[PDB]
Design an enzyme around this catalytic site. Structure first.
Site, mmCIF file in Angstrom:
data_model
loop_
_atom_site.group_PDB
_atom_site.id
_atom_site.type_symbol
_atom_site.label_atom_id
_atom_site.label_comp_id
_atom_site.label_asym_id
_atom_site.label_seq_id
_atom_site.Cartn_x
_atom_site.Cartn_y
_atom_site.Cartn_z
ATOM 1 N N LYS A 64 0.790 -1.378 -0.343
ATOM 2 C CA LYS A 64 0.480 0.125 0.261
ATOM 3 C C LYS A 64 0.690 1.326 -0.234
ATOM 4 C CE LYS A 64 -3.952 -2.083 1.870
ATOM 5 N NZ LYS A 64 -3.041 -3.587 1.573
ATOM 6 N N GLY A 178 -10.772 13.486 26.058
ATOM 7 C CA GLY A 178 -11.607 12.830 25.735
ATOM 8 C C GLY A 178 -12.510 12.773 26.595
ATOM 9 N N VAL A 180 -11.868 12.458 31.299
ATOM 10 C CA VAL A 180 -11.288 12.317 32.448
ATOM 11 C C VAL A 180 -11.359 11.266 33.838
ATOM 12 C CG1 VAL A 180 -10.445 14.095 35.027
ATOM 13 C CG2 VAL A 180 -11.576 14.767 32.663
ATOM 14 N N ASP A 181 -9.966 10.594 34.183
ATOM 15 C CA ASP A 181 -10.046 9.764 35.212
ATOM 16 C C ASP A 181 -9.321 10.371 36.251
ATOM 17 O OD1 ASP A 181 -11.123 7.986 32.157
ATOM 18 O OD2 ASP A 181 -9.064 7.040 32.257
HETATM 19 N N1 LIG Z 1 -8.520 -0.718 25.170
HETATM 20 C C1 LIG Z 1 -8.113 -0.403 25.679
HETATM 21 N N2 LIG Z 1 -8.694 1.040 24.667
HETATM 22 C C2 LIG Z 1 -9.204 1.746 25.837
HETATM 23 N N3 LIG Z 1 -8.285 2.017 26.712
HETATM 24 C C3 LIG Z 1 -7.430 0.740 27.261
HETATM 25 C C4 LIG Z 1 -7.502 0.075 26.669
HETATM 26 N N4 LIG Z 1 -6.604 -1.173 27.666
HETATM 27 C C5 LIG Z 1 -6.321 0.407 28.910
HETATM 28 N N5 LIG Z 1 -6.888 1.177 28.553
HETATM 29 C C6 LIG Z 1 -6.368 2.054 29.590
HETATM 30 C C7 LIG Z 1 -5.303 3.018 28.440
HETATM 31 C C8 LIG Z 1 -6.145 4.301 28.750
HETATM 32 O O1 LIG Z 1 -4.727 5.283 28.811
HETATM 33 C C9 LIG Z 1 -7.101 4.164 29.815
HETATM 34 C C10 LIG Z 1 -7.942 5.065 29.775
HETATM 35 O O2 LIG Z 1 -7.800 6.333 29.102
HETATM 36 P P1 LIG Z 1 -8.773 7.098 27.880
HETATM 37 O O3 LIG Z 1 -9.898 7.375 28.204
HETATM 38 O O4 LIG Z 1 -9.079 5.271 27.433
HETATM 39 O O5 LIG Z 1 -7.697 7.415 26.614
HETATM 40 P P2 LIG Z 1 -6.867 8.704 26.840
HETATM 41 O O6 LIG Z 1 -6.754 9.695 28.041
HETATM 42 O O7 LIG Z 1 -5.505 7.927 27.188
HETATM 43 O O8 LIG Z 1 -7.360 9.497 25.022
HETATM 44 P P3 LIG Z 1 -8.427 10.598 25.093
HETATM 45 O O9 LIG Z 1 -8.279 11.141 26.517
HETATM 46 O O10 LIG Z 1 -7.648 11.377 24.274
HETATM 47 O O11 LIG Z 1 -9.855 9.622 24.672
HETATM 48 O O12 LIG Z 1 -7.629 3.104 29.609
HETATM 49 CA CA LIG Z 2 -8.494 9.871 29.668
#
Ligand SMILES: Nc1ncnc2c1ncn2[C@H]1C[C@H](O)[C@@H](COP(=O)(O)OP(=O)(O)OP(=O)(O)O)O1
Ligand SMILES: [Ca+2]
Ligand SMILES: [Ca+2]
EC number: 2.7.7.7
Length: 319
Positions: A64, A178, A180-181
Site C-alpha cells: 500500500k 476526551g 477524565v480519569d
Molecule cells: N483497549 C483499551 N482501550 C482504551 N483504553 C485502555 C484499554 N486498555 C487499557 N486502557 C487504558 C488506557 C487508557 O489510558 C485508560 C483510559 O484512558 P482513555 O480515556 O481510554 O484514553 P486517553 O485518556 O488516554 O485518551 P483520550 O482522553 O484522548 O481519549 O484506559
Molecule cells: Ca481520558
DNA sequence: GCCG
DNA sequence: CAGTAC
DNA sequence: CGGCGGTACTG
C-alpha cells in the site's frame, strides 16, 4: 518529532477506521501499529524494501505504501463499504459496539433519530445517546483540571491525607482530553477504604454527577466508577468521568495503566511477556505456573527498572 | 493486519 | 454465555 | 498458525 510520512498515514488512518467500525478488531490493530511505526520513523519511506524492515510493517502494508509513493492514491479507499459512515455514527454511542452497530444497520436504521425511535436501548446506551454530542468533543485541558479539583475537594473532606491524580491524556500533557480519569489513593495504606461510596454520594448531592454508566466495579482491592459529570455555571457541557480508588501498594501500576496510552500499555504487556512477566492495573508479576509472584513496585520507575527499560516520561507514551 |  | 469498555 | 491481556459489569 515530525511525521515525515503524512502523505501515507493520512490515507491509512481512513482504512484503520473503516476496519475498526466493521468489527475487524485485529486487522485494525495492525494498521494502528503500522501507522505508529511510520510516523515515528526518522525519514520518509522511499521503497518496498525499506518499508518491510520497519517492525510493524509487512508485505501487505508495504504494498500500500508503495502504491501511495508511485501514484499518490490508494485504490482501496475507493471501495470501502457504504455502511462505514453509519457504523461510525452508531459506534460513537457509549455502550454500543460493532455487533450492535451492525444489528442496527441491518435493521435498516441510518441515523440517530432512527435509533431513538425504533430501537431498543440498554440503560447505558440511552445515556450514550443522550450525551452524544458532548461526548464527541474533547475538553480544554483547563476543564479537566477543574473536574479533578472538584473530585479532590469532595474527597479530602473525608480524609485530608488522600492523594488525587488525573491520569490519561491529561497527565501526558495533551492540550485537550476526551475524558477524565481521577485516581485516588492514600499513603498510609489503609485510609483509602470506605471512601469511594460516600464520595460518590457527596458528588451526586451537589449535582456534579449527573448519570452513572457503571456505578461500581470491584477489581481486587480497586474500586472504579464510570459516569457523567458537569461543572456548575452556565454553558458547561457533560463530560465522561472515571474515578478509581486503589490501595497504595498498587498505585504505581495503576498510575502507569490509567496514564496510558492504550498502545503503550499493549507494548508494555508484550515486553513483560518476553521477560516472563505480566502487567496489569494491579501489579507487575512473574508469569503463571496456581498464581504468580507479585514483584513490588513503589514507583513507576521501579516498573521500568524491573522490565529493563529506560524510563519514559508520560508525555512520551503516545505509543 | 504483523510477529514469532 | 455475549457484548462492551477499560 | 495462533497470539495480539485479563477482568468486571450489563442483559
Ligand atoms: N483497549 C483499551 N482501550 C482504551 N483504553 C485502555 C484499554 N486498555 C487499557 N486502557 C487504558 C488506557 C487508557 O489510558 C485508560 C483510559 O484512558 P482513555 O480515556 O481510554 O484514553 P486517553 O485518556 O488516554 O485518551 P483520550 O482522553 O484522548 O481519549 O484506559
Ligand atoms: Ca481520558
Ligand atoms: Ca517488518
Amino acid at each position: 518529532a515530525t511525521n515525515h510520512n503524512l502523505h501515507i498515514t493520512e490515507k491509512l488512518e481512513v482504512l484503520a477506521k473503516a476496519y475498526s467500525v466493521q468489527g475487524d478488531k485485529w486487522r485494525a490493530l495492525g494498521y494502528a501499529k503500522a501507522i505508529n511505526a511510520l510516523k515515528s520513523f526518522h525519514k520518509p519511506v522511499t521503497s518496498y524494501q525499506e518499508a518491510c524492515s520497519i517492525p510493524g510493517i509487512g508485505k501487505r502494508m508495504a504494498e500500500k505504501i508503495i502504491e501511495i509513493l508511485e501514484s499518490g492514491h490508494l485504490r482501496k479507499l475507493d471501495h470501502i463499504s457504504e455502511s462505514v459512515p453509519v457504523l461510525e455514527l452508531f459506534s460513537n454511542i457509549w455502550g454500543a459496539g460493532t455487533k450492535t452497530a451492525q444489528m442496527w444497520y441491518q435493521q435498516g436504521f441510518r441515523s440517530l433519530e432512527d435509533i431513538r425511535s425504533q430501537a431498543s436501548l440498554t440503560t447505558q446506551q440511552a445515556i450514550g445517546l443522550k450525551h452524544y454530542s458532548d461526548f464527541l468533543e474533547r475538553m480544554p485541558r483547563e476543564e479537566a483540571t477543574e473536574i479533578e479539583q472538584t473530585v479532590q475537594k469532595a474527597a479530602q473532606a473525608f480524609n485530608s491525607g488522600l492523594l488525587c491524580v488525573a491520569c490519561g491524556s491529561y497527565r501526558r500533557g495533551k492540550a485537550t482530553c476526551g475524558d477524565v480519569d481521577v485516581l485516588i489513593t492514600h499513603p498510609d495504606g489503609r485510609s483509602h477504604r470506605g471512601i469511594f461510596s460516600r464520595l460518590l454520594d457527596s458528588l451526586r448531592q451537589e449535582g456534579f454527577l449527573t448519570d452513572d454508566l457503571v456505578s461500581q466495579e470491584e477489581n481486587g482491592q480497586q474500586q472504579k466508577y464510570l459516569g457523567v459529570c458537569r461543572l456548575p455555571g452556565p454553558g458547561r457541557r457533560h463530560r465522561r468521568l472515571d474515578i478509581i480508588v486503589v490501595p497504595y501498594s498498587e498505585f504505581a501500576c495503576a498510575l502507569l495503566y490509567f496514564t496510558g496510552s492504550a498502545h503503550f500499555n499493549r507494548s508494555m504487556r508484550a515486553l513483560a511477556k518476553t521477560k516472563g512477566m505480566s502487567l496489569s492495573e494491579h501489579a507487575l508479576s512473574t508469569a503463571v505456573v496456581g498464581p504468580g509472584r507479585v514483584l513490588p513496585t513503589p514507583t513507576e520507575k521501579d516498573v521500568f527498572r524491573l522490565l529493563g527499560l529506560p524510563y519514559r516520561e508520560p508525555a512520551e507514551r503516545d505509543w
